[PDB]
């Protein structure tokens, strides 16, 4: 397993851009300049490797699971992803629609609801009160 | 440092491996499960796996519970239709007393009337949490449809039987199936001499074989369950191949050509034939994939779909047609090589952790005389041709189908019209 | 408080403020947690760490008629640990914590993840041997001291969702954070 | 012979269903006291899956395994 | 004194007969039932037959109930899969006000939210008392197995739907199926002029036809229900013939040759071929008989058995073989004549009482332009030959089977091995 | 009293002595019955006649926690009829009895039997 961990999260966002990291996470694996569109996905899947990401109140991470034989490619891809994502307008709008749809219906577990409420009341008036996803507005 | 298989005069198999890990793991594996029940004692094995802390001739229930807690350890029980496994985890130096507990749980249980009768109402609860995920009850129905007798029997207790499993049934099942020639003991984090000291306590247990059971007979069934849910789940299979067969490797490669599951978070699965086929038949959320099971005397291969209720007929058909094109021999070297890559890599990843590694070794120990290292598995994978994959697809297309569906079935098709 | 009497069951979470990643005290607290964790379906204790602060508390689900008793039981266990802990239970908690630490780091993925998180939070990888040495120093006196230092007579943060009519009033909850007989 | 009763003979009372409304003057046969079924366990509500990204990976690829532990939640593959 | 059929400009049929009886009976018959439901509104008709005393635009619920009680009368509702009937009984001179009640119940119901929501929990109770007799749920499953869509729909509400039938569904169903061209009004104990005065109130009701539905499609199904009961119930059928057909008369005579039911209290049924066949395959208590249903666009014929659990396979086979011998043309004039005797006599006995006589007339009025007197029925019976009976038996033997079984099925056979 | 706490529900029957076939009073009694016949699942009133004697009473089924109330209700209705009856209900009972008598005699079998 090989990954990049990044010292950034929701507690560094202001109310003007609360929710940016989650947005970026949605279109991280959607294409780079060197690998437009689904070429990156096809090359990951042709190695037999797995690719995952996550985002937290305080951290961010992207990693890959692979065979030890593939380390030169792995790192290559891993560097291509964090420096050269292609933020295309079409893909941005598609992700916007997807996230809005994902927020519309009550797609949250009650546990997550109460823990978000706890952070909001405990750390009110401070950046840690705010959620990773942010408001729909 | 390597594994060492061995068999005692009782017929018990023992194996171990001294990896220098801080946490030792010991598994006792048994040829038992729901396939050895019959219509008169269904659900026995479910209660049996839940009863794994009732009192024994050697230690009180209170003693077992508190003593396992006091060192931080765990005692799990895991079953399938064909095997059961009791596993113990502990820090280095804790083995001996936990091994006494293992011995008493498996070789000398008491099934006191009142403790059993207080344990009954938990079957309902356990089955309920299991049946929250919809996939489980669909697969349960698939086995009932697919087979007439043995692999048909359910993993979870029938509702009409809850509260009416008796102590005598438990005693009879244990006496007739927990026998030394059906057993293996596996140890990770443990030196062979120490595991010999452990196995020594098992020398005077029940000997020989037990009741062998019946062979599974195929059914061309169909089961439909009507609910109000807007999403419908479906499974469509045929009979494929026996566990540990070259033809089973063929079927595995076929599964990975069609599509076995996702690889990228939030991805489009462009490599997956089934997903890309379906994506052109529906515009609302779906899921599709391919399905493999294998047993001692049978196996199943097919497709599994989730879709909206009004779209089901279009989805199920679009999936099925894809397989047919492979049967007609639209298949490419590139796809096949990519599939074998997925398969070799997924296999090696499945055994990074000691927990699954122990399971795999224990599964092999019950059915083979020697341990097969992963290199050999990878070669066997490497040895499948294109013709084998196409033949497997033709077998699926030609043979008699079984089907299950659950949801609002106003537009789901019937097995006869696919 | 978000009230909705149509949901089957009530969900509840209650914390105080924890010390953060850097402090030593975390170890002792974890032991305490392991000691605590019937009335209701589901229950857990938790510690959530940040750079300079954190949340230390518990979460549970209840039938609507059994929220009060459960809160009573939980706060009583807290007061017990602050005032009356003993060696025998502490030993068990230390063993549970040992088992957890070694169980988590199985396979490459968790290990990689631990490396990354550790180099961001601590500046350095902390080896299991150092954790064992830190665990060995805890004793009932340490537990008493540190639990008192973070739990006893403090104002909590509370969140509730569900049929929560029977969730006690905030003054009643605050008064449960101390004993009159001590 | 075009009613169910004239045609079917002794299967007519299972091929037909009836409800006698407000109570009548004579007293009927097969009164049928009612020991109804007990209620199942109550559970939390289900979440929907109204996106492909949320359904991705839900389809089954392999048969199931049933698990339990003395200090761990019961689980299914 | 004779019946008089008649049809109004609305298309409503009316008929009456002034038998000089002290008790008058009036029936309103409608082409409605469960076959006109679909998977999105199952159970509607069950609640509809239970809702027959909720408030209306013309009279309060309290008024309807107490007013019917105060004269001693009754208002019944009876359904099938194809028809519904509302019937009123009263002493001479009571008609008028009860007819107002009938009109408001069928043409102008209110389905107030709170009354419907208070009425829901009675579905569970009604279904429970129905499902105490085991025959009912077996026959329900038989229809589900036998048909893909329409005659498959259940008479009693599905469990997942109880508490979730809405007022809007009731309104929609009534508006789309309670239409004047689907209706007949029948009166015994009533002079045609008086029944004309009654029918006059129906002149401004909903006109024309409604939604016509879908044709039933056959399924070669199989449904198995496992319980612990020591007795197992089974049904095995094929598709036979449409209602009101010569071939249906052939099938009826065949039923009575095989055996339709007992005639002597505590008798041995020596005349019954099925019973005598089975009696030589088992020595513990059994029951067997032959089964007939007929519909507007389909029909079913088969056998029905009750036996011990370990004997089922022997019983079901012994019964089936008997039919086969008739298909091969072991059939005798004497048996055939005796069967026709049983059939003519049973038919004439079925209509001694005014209640069943009204039902029969109302059934005819919905499907034919003129009333058929019993003499004509007896002649039609007289006109069946031996060759027709043998052909019917051959149809059964050759055609695709459907099967249901309920009990402890450890020895019941599967439909494929009969 | 036969006690068996494993059976789901309690069955109960209570009578007094009736007058027999020959007496006229039977008619009036039947009317009374029709007037009487919620708490429990099932309930009935009955008259059973013999040559010189009979049983006049009621039968019911209850949940075990609701036997007392039901007995109270039944005996209260009896006392009510003995002390406080009125014309309006009596009329209804007479009509119910008329309907029963004429409904029973339908078809040859019941008539032969009568
Ligand atoms: C008159 C006018 C009327 C009209 C007026 C109109 C206006 C009125 C408006 C106002 C209305 C108010 C209504 C009442 C509200 C009550 C609220 C309430 O109950 O809240 C529950 C409140 C909420 O908590 P919770 O959610 O229930 O949780 C329960 C937990 O267990 C919580 O656990 P915890 O540990 O936090 O707390 C438990 C502990 C907390 O308390 C303590 O641990 C101590 C508290 C402070 C010290 C008090 C010590 C008193 C000792 C007795 C007296 C001797 C003193 C010394 C002198 C010795 C002389 C020989 O309390 C107890 O266990 C209860 C008993 C405590 C005293 C122990 C002695 C018991 C026997 C008493 C009789 C003795 C008679 C003989 C005496 C000797 C011979 C003369 O919890 C309580 O349990 C509160 C306890 C209240 C105790 C009050 C004691 C008063 C009686 C004192 C003695 C009287 C006799 C004296 C005789 C003469 C000698 C001096
Ligand atoms: C005689 C003329 C006096 C004139 C002056 C004014 C008189 C009135 C003054 C107020 C008197 C109040 C008496 C009633 C008690 C009120 C208690 C109160 O308000 O505090 C609540 C609080 C409850 O605690 P919670 O935080 O809610 O729960 C904690 C759970 N972990 O009460 C307590 O402190 C309870 C514990 C006991 C406190 C002491 C009770 C009184 C007696 C103490 C002295 C004992 C000796 C008495 C001798 C009397 C003469 C023989």
Numbering used by the authors:
A (entry chain l): 70 to 206
B (entry chain k), E (entry chain K): 36 to 453
C (entry chain l): 276 to 312, 336 to 480
D (entry chain T): 1 to 77
F (entry chain L): 276 to 312, 336 to 412
Q: What did the publication describing this PDB structure actually write?
A:
CIII (cytochrome bc1 complex) plays a crucial role in electron transfer and proton pumping. The pumping of protons into the cristae lumen occurs via the Q-cycle, which involves sequential ubiquinol oxidation and ubiquinone reduction. Both reactions occur in specific quinone binding sites within the cytochrome b (Cyt-b) subunit, called Qo (oxidation) and Qi (reduction), which are essential for catalytic activity. Likewise, in the apicomplexan mETC, complex III2 (CIII) is the primary target for antiparasitic drugs.
As our mitochondria preparations of the obligate intracellular parasite T. gondii also contained substantial amounts of mitochondria from the host cells (‘Vero’ cells from the African green monkey, Cholorocebus sabaeus), the final cryo-EM sample contained a mixture of mitochondrial complexes from both species, which we classified computationally. From the same cryo-EM dataset, we thus also determined the structure of CIII within the co-purified Cholorocebus sabaeus I–III2–IV respirasome at 2.8 Å resolution (with atovaquone bound in Qi and Qo sites, see below), allowing direct comparison of architecture and inhibitor binding between parasite and host. Remarkably, we also found atovaquone bound not only in the Qo site, but also the Qi site of the C. sabaeus Cyt-b, which is part of the I–III2–IV supercomplex. Our structure indicates that in the dual-site inhibited mammalian Cyt-b, the atovaquone molecules of the Qi and Qo sites probably adopt two different tautomers to enable the formation of hydrogen bond networks in the two quinone binding sites. Thus, by co-determining the structures of both the mammalian and T. gondii CIII in the presence of equimolar atovaquone/ELQ-300 concentrations (10 µM) from the same heterogeneous sample and revealing their different drug binding, we provide structural evidence for the high parasite selectivity of ELQ-300 as a Qi-site inhibitor.
